[PDB]
Ligand binder design. Structure first.
Ligand SMILES: CC(=O)N[C@@H]1[C@@H](O)[C@H](O)[C@@H](CO)O[C@@H]1O
Length: 356
């Protein structure tokens, strides 16, 4: 979208000041996000990715339900700015757009800078599980099917591999072999959900560190800021995915793999914060799987990155041809380290469960 086009889009919303600029904000993989600067307040303007989220009406119904409930509890959350026609979003020139108020005086992190920040992230997402337990499974629509159904993701991967539409398979044999050889590990959470041994809960489903805003002065969690995948799942998806992104010593797309390690110190910090909020609620079987949920969600996301690479990068935004291969490689290195530290992560969870 050109500058003129974006100003036109913003004109559809009930903003409370004259727009001075609209500039790309962040490096999200999915939606297209802009910071709108006025002569007074600031706003986040987003074009929703309708290739990924085709059901905008149900997506926005979820977002409206979650934010209105948080507000009714006095909690800070994403504040939808309505269109001038009074709607929660608008279709404008072939795009689906929404506006949130910009949440001021915050810090957000694409990588853990210190254990305290990750411990606070643990508190925030653990607290968010208690919030989501207030909803029935049926109140929140699945916005994406099979979202953390790792065996289903693996079927998708094999289809991408078989098509090999760009002939990229030949250059990622070792990565393909990793996901093939780990196929026996993908079913554990889905099987437990299906047999009732793992409770079905409403979960956030994209608990990466940069989805919590911390207060710029105190560092206390202020608000969670991606509500697009709130829907039934397992607590293990939220824990495991937090560990995948945040217990890494490197960026998700770190090109130098010698920078990429799984840190048990960071794993412990997050576990302390998360289990601290949930200790009397977590089931024995959930606790048992906390360390492996890290391996599982990391393998699932890596497999998705590699599938996308093999499909010509149709899902995730990329900046260069091998971007998704580079992303997949970090996830592989992390899993390999998580495997080597399995006894230690088990002992960490036991100690936190005992301590809390
Ligand atoms: C809606 C969607 O696919 N979101 C994904 C999330 O699943 C994935 O873990 C992450 C990796 O950085 O990128 C996006 O946030």
């Amino acid at each position: 979208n050109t500058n003129e086009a974006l100003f036109d889009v913003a004109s559809h919303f009930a903003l409370e000041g004259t727009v001075d600029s609209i500039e790309p904000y962040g490096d999200g993989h999915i939606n297209t996000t802009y910071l709108v600067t006025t002569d007074g307040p600031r706003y986040i303007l987003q074009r929703m990715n309708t290739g990924i989220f085709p059901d905008t009406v149900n997506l926005m119904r979820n977002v409206e339900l979650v934010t209105s409930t948080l507000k009714a509890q006095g909690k800070e959350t994403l504040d939808i700015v309505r269109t001038t026609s009074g709607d929660t979003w608008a279709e404008i020139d072939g795009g689906a757009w929404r506006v949130y108020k910009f949440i001021e005086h915050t810090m957000s992190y694409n990588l853990v800078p210190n254990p305290d920040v990750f411990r606070e992230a643990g508190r925030a997402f653990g607290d968010f599980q208690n919030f989501l337990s207030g909803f029935d499974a049926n109140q929140l629509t699945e916005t994406i099917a099979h979202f953390h159904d790792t065996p289903h993701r693996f079927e998708d991967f094999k289809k991408a591999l078989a098509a090999d539409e760009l002939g990229r398979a030949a250059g990622c044999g070792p990565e393909i072999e990793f996901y093939l050889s780990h196929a026996d590990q993908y079913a554990v959470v889905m099987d437990g959900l299906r047999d009732g041994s793992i409770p079905l809960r409403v979960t956030h489903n994209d608990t990466k560190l940069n989805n919590i805003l911390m207060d710029a002065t105190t560092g206390k969690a202020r608000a969670i800021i991606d509500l697009d995948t709130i829907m039934p799942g397992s607590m293990l998806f939220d824990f495991g995915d937090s560990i995948r992104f945040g217990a890494s010593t490197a960026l998700e797309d770190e090109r130098d793999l010698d920078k990429v390690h799984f840190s048990t110190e960071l794993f412990r910090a997050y576990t302390e914060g998360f289990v601290g909020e949930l200790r009397d609620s977590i089931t024995a079987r959930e606790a048992e799987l906390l360390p492996f949920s890290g391996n599982l969600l990391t393998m699932e996301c890596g497999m998705r990155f590699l599938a996308d690479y093999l499909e010509g990068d149709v899902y995730f935004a990329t900046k260069y041809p091998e971007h998704n291969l580079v992303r997949s490689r970090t996830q592989i290195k992390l899993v390999r380290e998580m495997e080597q530290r399995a006894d230690e992560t088990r002992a960490i969870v036991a100690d936190v469960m005992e301590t809390t």
